[PDB]
């Protein structure tokens, strides 16, 4: 199906502690593949997936060089925003940047993104047309006007439709064994009496990839959304994901309930029953 590449950058000022913290991470779909941490010893972009480890020194030196230039822009940006919002030097502030691209089944360009947040809220974002900006407040208009004058959107559009898509394709090819894989969920149900009158039925999905999944409960074929406890999809730590959905069943009504599992790895959606 579709694929994406995303880079996530976090910049946190540290009053009276010197340099701001800077962390960068890169993902292809739901698989992390690179990292940079200003606090680590290496001061280099590093691999976090086996299929990129052997990319070679020209690749690693290049990613290291560019990510250090990102770090320097963010160090200055923190001071610029402190000024735009007339903030004191005493407080810690966070800048976040995310950019990347989506490709379709045929792997050609579908969408590009480039967006920033200051202290957890939208600051500026490149619009879908990759030609215009959305400035979230008064301060952000100064950036919008500056970026409009310096033709920043044209430069970002070139990267998003070019390098981004080109390298996403390369990584999908190099990491085929694990990026182009689909691991269907291993599923099971558990039953525990809260009390003799009631029991919890919990429907599990384990060891799946990609993360996208739908887990629902029905009672006599009717959706039980309001009465389902559904946990956020969570990483197992080995590159797979987990999720569960639970309902409280009055004792003796187990047969009325069905759990429904939908995932890209399943040829047909699953219907599970406690029986």
């Amino acid at each position: 199906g579709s694929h994406s590449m995303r880079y996530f950058f976090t910049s946190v000022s540290r009053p009276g502690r010197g340099e701001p913290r800077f962390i960068a991470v890169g993902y292809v779909d739901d698989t992390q593949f690179v990292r940079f941490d200003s606090d680590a010893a290496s001061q280099r972009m590093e691999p976090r997936a086996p299929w990129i480890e052997q990319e070679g020194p020209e690749y690693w030196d290049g990613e290291t060089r560019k990510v250090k230039a990102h770090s320097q822009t963010h160090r200055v940006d923190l001071g610029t925003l402190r000024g735009y919002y007339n903030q004191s030097e005493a407080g810690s502030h966070t800048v976040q940047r995310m950019y990347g691209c989506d490709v379709g089944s045929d792997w050609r360009f579908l969408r590009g993104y480039h967006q920033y947040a200051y202290d957890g809220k939208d600051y500026i974002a490149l619009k879908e047309d990759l030609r215009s900006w959305t400035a979230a407040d008064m301060a952000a208009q100064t950036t919008k006007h500056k970026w409009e004058a310096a033709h920043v959107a044209e430069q970002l559009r070139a990267y998003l439709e070019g390098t981004c898509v080109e390298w996403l394709r390369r990584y999908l090819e190099n990491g085929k064994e694990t990026l182009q894989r689909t691991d269907a969920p291993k599923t099971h149900m558990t039953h525990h009496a809260v009390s003799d009158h009631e029991a919890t039925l919990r429907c599990w999905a384990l060891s799946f990839y990609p993360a996208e999944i739908t887990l629902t409960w029905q009672r006599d074929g009717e959706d039980q959304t309001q009465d389902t406890e559904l946990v956020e999809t969570r990483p197992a730590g080995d590159g797979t994901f987990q999720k569960w959905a639970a309902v409280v069943v009055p004792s003796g009504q187990e047969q009325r309930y069905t759990c429904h599992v939908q995932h890209e790895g399943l040829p047909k959606p699953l219907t599970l029953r406690w029986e």
Partner: peptide
């Protein structure tokens, strides 16, 4: 690969 040019806020 990350972007080559980064512009200031």
């Amino acid at each position: 690969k990350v972007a080559e040019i980064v512009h200031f806020l």
